[PDB]
Amino acid sequence: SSVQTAATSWGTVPSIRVYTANNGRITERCWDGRGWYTGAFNRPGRNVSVTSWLVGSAIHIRVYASTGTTTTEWCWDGNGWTRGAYTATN
Amino acid sequence: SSVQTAATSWGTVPSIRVYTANNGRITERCWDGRGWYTGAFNRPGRNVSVTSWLVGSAIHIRVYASTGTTTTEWCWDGNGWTRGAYTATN
Amino acid sequence: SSVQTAATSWGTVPSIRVYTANNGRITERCWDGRGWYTGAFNRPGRNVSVTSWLVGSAIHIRVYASTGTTTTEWCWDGNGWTRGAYTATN
């Protein structure tokens, strides 16, 4: 009945990332203190959650994107989005 | 099939804020270590997410409230809730 | 149309907890740097949110689990999951 969103932030500027699931895809909007812009993250899904943490100055992001079938973890560790080891069951 | 919630916390007391979307509106319940109370935040919406960060002692909160139409960012920076610059597309 | 998830993380390893609402129950998957494993948390619900904070080295987690009827707060403070004081209305 609406879009579904997830948000994380870090530092004191701050940086913010808002993930939105809408019409079958999850997209990303970014704030680094200078205006909102569209981020590189783009994956299929109907539901999203996110968490992040800093290691010094470097941000690490984990996005849990769920399609009708599968929850996939996507990792940002400074050099592109990569598939994470997360599984719902083992 | 249920209410939808979003939560954030800060400090070591801690302070907690739980946002609940139910029956067309998003309301807020607050913990500052002395019992739960109803907060000032009250906006239309079916989906909510939240993030927050501290600048020293001062809390800054961003709530992303999504109606059927629109995702609106609401800002708490110590002196009331204000509309944020967030847009889903530019 | 999909599962619904919520995530939190802490420290620099880090530790991550991903809560998934699916088929009437909320379950937990855990990362402590050595592989994903199933956590002790298991409660009824259709929607979940989570927040956590550290007090020194000790993690404190709050999970807001919502069934069709009720939002219940579940607390992890180092010695099992316990019912929290949270209420949606007072």
Side-chain angles (χ1 to χ4, degrees), chain A residues 6-69:
Chain A
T8 193
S9 60
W10 64 89
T12 42
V13 175
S15 281
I16 309 166
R17 296 295 180 268
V18 181
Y19 301 85
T20 299
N22 185 47
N23 294 155
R25 302 204 66 77
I26 302 159
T27 61
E28 176 192 43
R29 293 284 280 170
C30 313
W31 174 267
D32 295 317
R34 312 172 193 171
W36 288 90
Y37 67 93
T38 300
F41 183 89
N42 190 310
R43 291 295 182 280
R46 298 289 160 163
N47 176 263
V48 62
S49 70
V50 62
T51 191
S52 71
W53 63 96
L54 287 162
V55 179
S57 66
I59 189 68
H60 298 269
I61 314 174
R62 299 292 186 271
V63 178
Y64 300 92
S66 297
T67 60
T69 41

Short mmCIF file of all heavy atoms in Angstrom, two decimals, chain A residues 6-69:
data_model
loop_
_atom_site.label_atom_id
_atom_site.label_comp_id
_atom_site.label_asym_id
_atom_site.label_seq_id
_atom_site.Cartn_x
_atom_site.Cartn_y
_atom_site.Cartn_z
N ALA A 6 14.31 1.87 4.44
CA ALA A 6 15.26 1.53 5.50
C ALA A 6 16.33 2.60 5.47
O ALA A 6 16.64 3.10 4.38
CB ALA A 6 15.90 0.15 5.27
N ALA A 7 16.86 2.96 6.63
CA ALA A 7 17.80 4.08 6.71
C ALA A 7 18.96 3.78 7.64
O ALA A 7 18.80 3.06 8.63
CB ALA A 7 17.10 5.35 7.20
N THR A 8 20.13 4.36 7.32
CA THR A 8 21.30 4.29 8.19
C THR A 8 22.06 5.61 8.04
O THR A 8 21.90 6.34 7.05
CB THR A 8 22.18 3.08 7.84
OG1 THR A 8 23.14 2.86 8.88
CG2 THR A 8 22.91 3.27 6.53
N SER A 9 22.87 5.92 9.04
CA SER A 9 23.65 7.15 9.03
C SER A 9 24.96 6.94 9.79
O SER A 9 25.10 5.99 10.55
CB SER A 9 22.87 8.31 9.65
OG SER A 9 22.55 8.00 10.97
N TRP A 10 25.94 7.82 9.55
CA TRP A 10 27.22 7.69 10.23
C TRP A 10 27.95 9.02 10.23
O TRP A 10 27.69 9.89 9.40
CB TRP A 10 28.11 6.62 9.58
CG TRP A 10 28.55 6.87 8.18
CD1 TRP A 10 29.69 7.55 7.76
CD2 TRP A 10 27.88 6.46 6.98
NE1 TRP A 10 29.75 7.56 6.40
CE2 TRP A 10 28.66 6.88 5.89
CE3 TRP A 10 26.69 5.74 6.72
CZ2 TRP A 10 28.30 6.63 4.57
CZ3 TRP A 10 26.34 5.51 5.38
CH2 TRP A 10 27.14 5.94 4.34
N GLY A 11 28.84 9.16 11.19
CA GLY A 11 29.63 10.35 11.34
C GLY A 11 28.79 11.52 11.84
O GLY A 11 27.65 11.40 12.30
N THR A 12 29.44 12.70 11.82
CA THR A 12 28.80 13.90 12.35
C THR A 12 28.36 14.88 11.28
O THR A 12 27.69 15.87 11.62
CB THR A 12 29.73 14.64 13.35
OG1 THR A 12 31.07 14.67 12.83
CG2 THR A 12 29.72 13.95 14.72
N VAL A 13 28.70 14.65 9.99
CA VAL A 13 28.14 15.51 8.96
C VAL A 13 26.61 15.54 9.05
O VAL A 13 26.05 16.64 9.12
CB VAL A 13 28.66 15.11 7.57
CG1 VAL A 13 27.99 15.93 6.48
CG2 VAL A 13 30.19 15.25 7.46
N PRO A 14 25.89 14.41 9.01
CA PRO A 14 26.33 13.04 8.81
C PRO A 14 26.24 12.60 7.38
O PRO A 14 25.80 13.36 6.53
CB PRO A 14 25.30 12.24 9.64
CG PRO A 14 24.05 12.93 9.31
CD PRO A 14 24.44 14.45 9.23
N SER A 15 26.59 11.34 7.12
CA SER A 15 26.16 10.68 5.90
C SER A 15 24.93 9.86 6.22
O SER A 15 24.85 9.25 7.29
CB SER A 15 27.25 9.79 5.34
OG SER A 15 28.22 10.56 4.66
N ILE A 16 23.97 9.86 5.29
CA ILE A 16 22.72 9.12 5.43
C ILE A 16 22.52 8.29 4.16
O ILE A 16 22.83 8.75 3.06
CB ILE A 16 21.49 10.00 5.66
CG1 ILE A 16 21.70 11.02 6.81
CG2 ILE A 16 20.25 9.10 5.94
CD1 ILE A 16 20.60 12.10 6.78
N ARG A 17 21.97 7.09 4.30
CA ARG A 17 21.58 6.33 3.13
C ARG A 17 20.15 5.85 3.39
O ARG A 17 19.87 5.36 4.49
CB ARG A 17 22.48 5.13 2.89
CG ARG A 17 23.95 5.46 2.56
CD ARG A 17 24.12 6.19 1.26
NE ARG A 17 25.54 6.49 0.96
CZ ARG A 17 26.14 7.63 1.31
NH1 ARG A 17 25.50 8.55 1.97
NH2 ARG A 17 27.41 7.81 1.04
N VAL A 18 19.26 6.08 2.43
CA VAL A 18 17.85 5.68 2.53
C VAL A 18 17.62 4.71 1.38
O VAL A 18 17.82 5.07 0.21
CB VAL A 18 16.91 6.88 2.44
CG1 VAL A 18 15.44 6.39 2.57
CG2 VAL A 18 17.22 7.88 3.54
N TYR A 19 17.22 3.48 1.72
CA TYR A 19 16.90 2.46 0.72
C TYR A 19 15.39 2.33 0.60
O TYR A 19 14.68 2.27 1.61
CB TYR A 19 17.50 1.12 1.12
CG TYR A 19 19.00 1.26 1.25
CD1 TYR A 19 19.57 1.70 2.44
CD2 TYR A 19 19.85 1.01 0.17
CE1 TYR A 19 20.96 1.88 2.54
CE2 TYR A 19 21.21 1.17 0.27
CZ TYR A 19 21.76 1.61 1.49
OH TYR A 19 23.10 1.85 1.61
N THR A 20 14.89 2.32 -0.64
CA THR A 20 13.46 2.25 -0.90
C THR A 20 13.14 1.07 -1.81
O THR A 20 13.61 1.00 -2.94
CB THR A 20 12.97 3.54 -1.55
OG1 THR A 20 13.21 4.60 -0.66
CG2 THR A 20 11.44 3.44 -1.77
N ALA A 21 12.28 0.19 -1.33
CA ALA A 21 11.71 -0.87 -2.13
C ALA A 21 10.40 -0.37 -2.74
O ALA A 21 9.46 -0.02 -2.03
CB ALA A 21 11.47 -2.09 -1.24
N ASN A 22 10.32 -0.42 -4.07
CA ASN A 22 9.14 0.06 -4.78
C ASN A 22 9.13 -0.62 -6.15
O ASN A 22 10.17 -0.67 -6.83
CB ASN A 22 9.16 1.58 -4.93
CG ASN A 22 7.89 2.12 -5.58
OD1 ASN A 22 6.77 1.74 -5.20
ND2 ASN A 22 8.05 2.97 -6.58
N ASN A 23 7.96 -1.12 -6.56
CA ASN A 23 7.76 -1.67 -7.91
C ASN A 23 8.81 -2.73 -8.27
O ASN A 23 9.30 -2.79 -9.40
CB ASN A 23 7.77 -0.56 -8.96
CG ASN A 23 6.60 0.40 -8.85
OD1 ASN A 23 6.70 1.54 -9.28
ND2 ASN A 23 5.50 -0.05 -8.26
N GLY A 24 9.15 -3.57 -7.31
CA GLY A 24 10.02 -4.70 -7.56
C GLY A 24 11.52 -4.46 -7.40
O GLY A 24 12.29 -5.44 -7.43
N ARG A 25 11.94 -3.22 -7.13
CA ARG A 25 13.36 -2.95 -6.98
C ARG A 25 13.65 -2.10 -5.75
O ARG A 25 12.81 -1.33 -5.30
CB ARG A 25 13.91 -2.24 -8.22
CG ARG A 25 13.69 -3.05 -9.51
CD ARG A 25 14.70 -2.68 -10.57
NE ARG A 25 16.08 -3.03 -10.26
CZ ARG A 25 16.58 -4.26 -10.35
NH1 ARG A 25 15.83 -5.29 -10.74
NH2 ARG A 25 17.86 -4.46 -10.02
N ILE A 26 14.86 -2.27 -5.24
CA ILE A 26 15.36 -1.47 -4.11
C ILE A 26 16.42 -0.53 -4.65
O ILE A 26 17.41 -0.97 -5.24
CB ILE A 26 15.95 -2.34 -3.01
CG1 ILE A 26 14.93 -3.33 -2.47
CG2 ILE A 26 16.49 -1.43 -1.88
CD1 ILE A 26 15.56 -4.49 -1.77
N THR A 27 16.21 0.78 -4.45
CA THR A 27 17.14 1.80 -4.89
C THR A 27 17.59 2.58 -3.67
O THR A 27 17.06 2.39 -2.58
CB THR A 27 16.52 2.73 -5.94
OG1 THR A 27 15.39 3.39 -5.39
CG2 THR A 27 16.06 1.91 -7.15
N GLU A 28 18.59 3.44 -3.87
CA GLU A 28 19.31 4.09 -2.78
C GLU A 28 19.42 5.58 -3.06
O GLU A 28 19.75 6.00 -4.17
CB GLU A 28 20.70 3.47 -2.63
CG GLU A 28 21.65 4.10 -1.59
CD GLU A 28 23.07 3.59 -1.73
OE1 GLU A 28 23.55 3.48 -2.87
OE2 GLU A 28 23.71 3.27 -0.72
N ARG A 29 19.16 6.38 -2.04
CA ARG A 29 19.35 7.83 -2.06
C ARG A 29 20.32 8.18 -0.95
O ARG A 29 20.26 7.62 0.14
CB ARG A 29 18.03 8.56 -1.86
CG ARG A 29 17.06 8.36 -3.04
CD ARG A 29 17.47 9.21 -4.24
NE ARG A 29 17.05 10.60 -4.08
CZ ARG A 29 17.43 11.58 -4.87
NH1 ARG A 29 18.26 11.35 -5.87
NH2 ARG A 29 17.00 12.81 -4.64
N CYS A 30 21.25 9.09 -1.27
CA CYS A 30 22.42 9.35 -0.44
C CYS A 30 22.49 10.82 -0.07
O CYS A 30 22.18 11.70 -0.88
CB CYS A 30 23.71 8.98 -1.16
SG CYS A 30 23.66 7.38 -1.96
N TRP A 31 22.88 11.08 1.17
CA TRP A 31 23.19 12.40 1.69
C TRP A 31 24.59 12.36 2.28
O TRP A 31 24.89 11.52 3.12
CB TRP A 31 22.16 12.79 2.74
CG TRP A 31 22.48 14.10 3.46
CD1 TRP A 31 23.16 14.23 4.61
CD2 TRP A 31 22.06 15.40 3.06
NE1 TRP A 31 23.22 15.59 4.97
CE2 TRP A 31 22.54 16.30 4.02
CE3 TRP A 31 21.29 15.89 1.98
CZ2 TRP A 31 22.31 17.68 3.93
CZ3 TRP A 31 21.07 17.24 1.91
CH2 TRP A 31 21.57 18.11 2.87
N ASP A 32 25.46 13.27 1.82
CA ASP A 32 26.78 13.46 2.39
C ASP A 32 26.97 14.92 2.79
O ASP A 32 28.09 15.43 2.83
CB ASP A 32 27.87 13.03 1.41
CG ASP A 32 27.84 11.53 1.11
OD1 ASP A 32 27.66 10.75 2.05
OD2 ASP A 32 28.01 11.15 -0.07
N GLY A 33 25.87 15.61 3.06
CA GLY A 33 25.90 16.98 3.51
C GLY A 33 25.77 18.02 2.43
O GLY A 33 25.68 19.22 2.75
N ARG A 34 25.70 17.61 1.16
CA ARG A 34 25.67 18.54 0.03
C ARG A 34 24.47 18.35 -0.88
O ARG A 34 24.52 18.73 -2.06
CB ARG A 34 26.92 18.41 -0.83
CG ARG A 34 28.23 18.42 -0.12
CD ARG A 34 29.29 18.09 -1.16
NE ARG A 34 30.58 17.74 -0.59
CZ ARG A 34 31.58 17.25 -1.31
NH1 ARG A 34 31.44 17.04 -2.61
NH2 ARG A 34 32.75 16.99 -0.72
N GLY A 35 23.41 17.73 -0.40
CA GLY A 35 22.30 17.47 -1.29
C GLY A 35 22.09 15.97 -1.48
O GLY A 35 23.02 15.17 -1.36
N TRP A 36 20.86 15.59 -1.77
CA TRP A 36 20.53 14.19 -2.00
C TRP A 36 20.87 13.77 -3.43
O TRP A 36 20.66 14.53 -4.38
CB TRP A 36 19.03 13.96 -1.73
CG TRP A 36 18.74 14.01 -0.26
CD1 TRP A 36 18.40 15.13 0.48
CD2 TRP A 36 18.86 12.94 0.68
NE1 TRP A 36 18.27 14.82 1.79
CE2 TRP A 36 18.54 13.48 1.96
CE3 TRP A 36 19.16 11.58 0.58
CZ2 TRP A 36 18.54 12.71 3.11
CZ3 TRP A 36 19.16 10.81 1.73
CH2 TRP A 36 18.84 11.37 2.98
N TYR A 37 21.42 12.57 -3.57
CA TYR A 37 21.77 12.00 -4.86
C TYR A 37 21.47 10.50 -4.86
O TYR A 37 21.32 9.86 -3.82
CB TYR A 37 23.25 12.28 -5.22
CG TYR A 37 24.31 11.60 -4.37
CD1 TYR A 37 24.84 10.38 -4.76
CD2 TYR A 37 24.79 12.17 -3.20
CE1 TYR A 37 25.81 9.75 -4.00
CE2 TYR A 37 25.75 11.54 -2.42
CZ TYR A 37 26.26 10.33 -2.82
OH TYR A 37 27.19 9.66 -2.07
N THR A 38 21.36 9.95 -6.07
CA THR A 38 21.04 8.54 -6.24
C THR A 38 22.33 7.72 -6.15
O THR A 38 23.33 8.06 -6.78
CB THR A 38 20.34 8.30 -7.57
OG1 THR A 38 19.13 9.05 -7.59
CG2 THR A 38 20.03 6.83 -7.76
N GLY A 39 22.30 6.67 -5.32
CA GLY A 39 23.46 5.84 -5.11
C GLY A 39 23.56 4.68 -6.07
O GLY A 39 22.68 4.43 -6.89
N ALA A 40 24.69 3.98 -5.98
CA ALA A 40 24.96 2.87 -6.89
C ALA A 40 24.09 1.65 -6.58
O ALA A 40 23.88 0.81 -7.47
CB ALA A 40 26.44 2.49 -6.83
N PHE A 41 23.61 1.50 -5.35
CA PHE A 41 22.88 0.28 -4.99
C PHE A 41 21.60 0.17 -5.81
O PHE A 41 20.76 1.08 -5.82
CB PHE A 41 22.56 0.25 -3.49
CG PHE A 41 21.87 -1.02 -3.07
CD1 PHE A 41 22.60 -2.11 -2.68
CD2 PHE A 41 20.50 -1.12 -3.11
CE1 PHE A 41 21.97 -3.30 -2.35
CE2 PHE A 41 19.87 -2.32 -2.76
CZ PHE A 41 20.61 -3.39 -2.36
N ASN A 42 21.40 -0.99 -6.44
CA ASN A 42 20.17 -1.25 -7.17
C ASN A 42 20.02 -2.76 -7.30
O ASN A 42 20.84 -3.39 -7.96
CB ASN A 42 20.21 -0.58 -8.54
CG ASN A 42 18.87 -0.62 -9.24
OD1 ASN A 42 18.24 -1.67 -9.33
ND2 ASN A 42 18.42 0.53 -9.74
N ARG A 43 19.04 -3.33 -6.62
CA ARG A 43 18.84 -4.76 -6.57
C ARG A 43 17.35 -5.05 -6.60
O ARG A 43 16.54 -4.18 -6.25
CB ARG A 43 19.45 -5.37 -5.31
CG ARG A 43 21.00 -5.36 -5.25
CD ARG A 43 21.62 -6.27 -6.34
NE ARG A 43 23.08 -6.30 -6.28
CZ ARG A 43 23.89 -5.36 -6.77
NH1 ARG A 43 23.39 -4.31 -7.40
NH2 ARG A 43 25.20 -5.47 -6.63
N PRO A 44 16.93 -6.24 -7.03
CA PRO A 44 15.52 -6.60 -6.91
C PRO A 44 15.11 -6.77 -5.46
O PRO A 44 15.91 -7.16 -4.60
CB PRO A 44 15.44 -7.94 -7.66
CG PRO A 44 16.78 -8.53 -7.43
CD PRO A 44 17.74 -7.36 -7.55
N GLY A 45 13.84 -6.51 -5.18
CA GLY A 45 13.33 -6.85 -3.86
C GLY A 45 12.04 -6.12 -3.51
O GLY A 45 11.68 -5.09 -4.09
N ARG A 46 11.35 -6.62 -2.51
CA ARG A 46 10.11 -6.04 -1.98
C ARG A 46 10.31 -5.52 -0.56
O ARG A 46 9.46 -4.85 -0.13
CB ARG A 46 9.01 -7.08 -1.88
CG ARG A 46 8.62 -7.67 -3.21
CD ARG A 46 7.87 -6.70 -4.08
NE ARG A 46 7.87 -7.02 -5.50
CZ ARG A 46 7.02 -6.50 -6.37
NH1 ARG A 46 6.12 -5.63 -5.96
NH2 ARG A 46 7.07 -6.84 -7.65
N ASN A 47 11.35 -5.96 0.12
CA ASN A 47 11.59 -5.54 1.50
C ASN A 47 13.09 -5.31 1.67
O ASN A 47 13.91 -6.02 1.09
CB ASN A 47 11.12 -6.62 2.49
CG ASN A 47 11.41 -6.28 3.91
OD1 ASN A 47 12.43 -6.75 4.48
ND2 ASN A 47 10.55 -5.47 4.52
N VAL A 48 13.44 -4.29 2.41
CA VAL A 48 14.85 -3.99 2.66
C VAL A 48 15.05 -3.62 4.13
O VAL A 48 14.21 -2.96 4.77
CB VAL A 48 15.35 -2.84 1.74
CG1 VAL A 48 14.61 -1.52 1.96
CG2 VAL A 48 16.85 -2.64 1.95
N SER A 49 16.17 -4.04 4.68
CA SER A 49 16.68 -3.52 5.95
C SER A 49 18.16 -3.21 5.76
O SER A 49 18.76 -3.64 4.78
CB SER A 49 16.50 -4.48 7.10
OG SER A 49 17.33 -5.62 7.01
N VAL A 50 18.72 -2.39 6.66
CA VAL A 50 20.12 -2.01 6.53
C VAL A 50 20.74 -1.81 7.91
O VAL A 50 20.09 -1.37 8.86
CB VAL A 50 20.30 -0.73 5.69
CG1 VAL A 50 19.60 0.45 6.36
CG2 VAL A 50 21.78 -0.38 5.51
N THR A 51 22.05 -2.07 7.99
CA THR A 51 22.85 -1.67 9.14
C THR A 51 24.23 -1.26 8.64
O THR A 51 24.67 -1.67 7.58
CB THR A 51 22.93 -2.77 10.19
OG1 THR A 51 23.49 -2.21 11.36
CG2 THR A 51 23.73 -3.95 9.75
N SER A 52 24.90 -0.42 9.41
CA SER A 52 26.25 0.00 9.03
C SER A 52 27.11 0.27 10.25
O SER A 52 26.62 0.45 11.36
CB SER A 52 26.21 1.25 8.14
OG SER A 52 25.82 2.42 8.88
N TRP A 53 28.42 0.30 10.03
CA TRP A 53 29.35 0.58 11.11
C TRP A 53 30.61 1.17 10.51
O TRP A 53 30.94 0.92 9.35
CB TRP A 53 29.73 -0.67 11.94
CG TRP A 53 30.46 -1.72 11.11
CD1 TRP A 53 31.80 -1.89 11.00
CD2 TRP A 53 29.86 -2.75 10.27
NE1 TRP A 53 32.09 -2.92 10.16
CE2 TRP A 53 30.92 -3.46 9.69
CE3 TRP A 53 28.53 -3.12 9.96
CZ2 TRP A 53 30.73 -4.52 8.80
CZ3 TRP A 53 28.33 -4.18 9.10
CH2 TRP A 53 29.42 -4.89 8.54
N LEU A 54 31.31 1.94 11.30
CA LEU A 54 32.56 2.54 10.91
C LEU A 54 33.72 1.74 11.47
O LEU A 54 33.65 1.21 12.59
CB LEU A 54 32.66 3.98 11.43
CG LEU A 54 31.81 5.02 10.73
CD1 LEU A 54 31.72 6.24 11.68
CD2 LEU A 54 32.43 5.39 9.42
N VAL A 55 34.79 1.67 10.69
CA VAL A 55 36.09 1.19 11.14
C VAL A 55 37.01 2.37 10.89
O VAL A 55 37.43 2.60 9.76
CB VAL A 55 36.55 -0.07 10.41
CG1 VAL A 55 37.94 -0.51 10.92
CG2 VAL A 55 35.54 -1.17 10.60
N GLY A 56 37.23 3.17 11.92
CA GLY A 56 37.90 4.45 11.74
C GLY A 56 37.05 5.40 10.92
O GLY A 56 35.93 5.76 11.31
N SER A 57 37.57 5.80 9.76
CA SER A 57 36.86 6.68 8.85
C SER A 57 36.04 5.93 7.79
O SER A 57 35.23 6.54 7.11
CB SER A 57 37.85 7.62 8.14
OG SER A 57 38.73 6.91 7.28
N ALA A 58 36.26 4.62 7.64
CA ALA A 58 35.74 3.86 6.52
C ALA A 58 34.39 3.28 6.92
O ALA A 58 34.26 2.70 8.01
CB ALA A 58 36.72 2.75 6.13
N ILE A 59 33.38 3.46 6.05
CA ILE A 59 32.04 2.95 6.34
C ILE A 59 31.91 1.56 5.76
O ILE A 59 32.46 1.26 4.71
CB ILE A 59 30.94 3.89 5.81
CG1 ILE A 59 29.58 3.44 6.31
CG2 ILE A 59 30.94 3.91 4.28
CD1 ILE A 59 29.38 3.61 7.78
N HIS A 60 31.17 0.71 6.47
CA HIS A 60 30.81 -0.63 6.04
C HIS A 60 29.30 -0.74 6.14
O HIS A 60 28.73 -0.44 7.19
CB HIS A 60 31.50 -1.67 6.90
CG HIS A 60 33.00 -1.59 6.79
ND1 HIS A 60 33.70 -2.33 5.86
CD2 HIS A 60 33.90 -0.80 7.41
CE1 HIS A 60 34.99 -2.04 5.97
NE2 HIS A 60 35.14 -1.10 6.89
N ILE A 61 28.65 -1.12 5.04
CA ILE A 61 27.19 -1.18 4.98
C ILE A 61 26.75 -2.60 4.65
O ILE A 61 27.38 -3.27 3.83
CB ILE A 61 26.59 -0.19 3.94
CG1 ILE A 61 27.24 1.20 4.05
CG2 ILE A 61 25.06 -0.08 4.11
CD1 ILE A 61 26.80 2.13 2.96
N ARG A 62 25.66 -3.05 5.26
CA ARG A 62 25.05 -4.33 4.93
C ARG A 62 23.58 -4.08 4.67
O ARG A 62 22.90 -3.55 5.54
CB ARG A 62 25.24 -5.33 6.05
CG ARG A 62 26.70 -5.62 6.32
CD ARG A 62 27.34 -6.37 5.13
NE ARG A 62 28.72 -6.77 5.46
CZ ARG A 62 29.79 -6.01 5.23
NH1 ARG A 62 29.66 -4.83 4.65
NH2 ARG A 62 31.00 -6.45 5.59
N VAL A 63 23.12 -4.42 3.47
CA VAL A 63 21.73 -4.27 3.05
C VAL A 63 21.16 -5.68 2.89
O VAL A 63 21.74 -6.52 2.19
CB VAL A 63 21.62 -3.49 1.74
CG1 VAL A 63 20.18 -3.37 1.26
CG2 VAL A 63 22.17 -2.09 1.90
N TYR A 64 20.03 -5.93 3.53
CA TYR A 64 19.35 -7.23 3.43
C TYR A 64 18.14 -7.00 2.54
O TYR A 64 17.15 -6.39 2.97
CB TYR A 64 19.04 -7.78 4.81
CG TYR A 64 20.32 -7.96 5.59
CD1 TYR A 64 20.81 -6.94 6.42
CD2 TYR A 64 21.10 -9.09 5.43
CE1 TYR A 64 22.03 -7.10 7.10
CE2 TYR A 64 22.31 -9.24 6.11
CZ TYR A 64 22.77 -8.20 6.93
OH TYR A 64 23.99 -8.31 7.59
N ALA A 65 18.25 -7.48 1.29
CA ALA A 65 17.22 -7.32 0.27
C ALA A 65 16.45 -8.63 0.10
O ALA A 65 17.05 -9.69 -0.16
CB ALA A 65 17.83 -6.87 -1.06
N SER A 66 15.15 -8.57 0.23
CA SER A 66 14.30 -9.74 0.16
C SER A 66 13.35 -9.65 -1.03
O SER A 66 12.50 -8.74 -1.11
CB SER A 66 13.52 -9.91 1.45
OG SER A 66 14.40 -10.13 2.53
N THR A 67 13.49 -10.58 -1.95
CA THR A 67 12.56 -10.76 -3.04
C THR A 67 11.43 -11.65 -2.50
O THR A 67 11.37 -11.95 -1.31
CB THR A 67 13.24 -11.38 -4.26
OG1 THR A 67 13.78 -12.67 -3.91
CG2 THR A 67 14.38 -10.49 -4.77
N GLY A 68 10.54 -12.11 -3.38
CA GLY A 68 9.54 -13.07 -2.92
C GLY A 68 10.15 -14.37 -2.45
O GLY A 68 9.58 -15.04 -1.58
N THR A 69 11.32 -14.72 -2.98
CA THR A 69 11.97 -16.01 -2.76
C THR A 69 13.03 -15.98 -1.65
O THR A 69 13.13 -16.94 -0.87
CB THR A 69 12.68 -16.48 -4.03
OG1 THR A 69 13.32 -15.34 -4.64
CG2 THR A 69 11.69 -17.11 -5.00
#
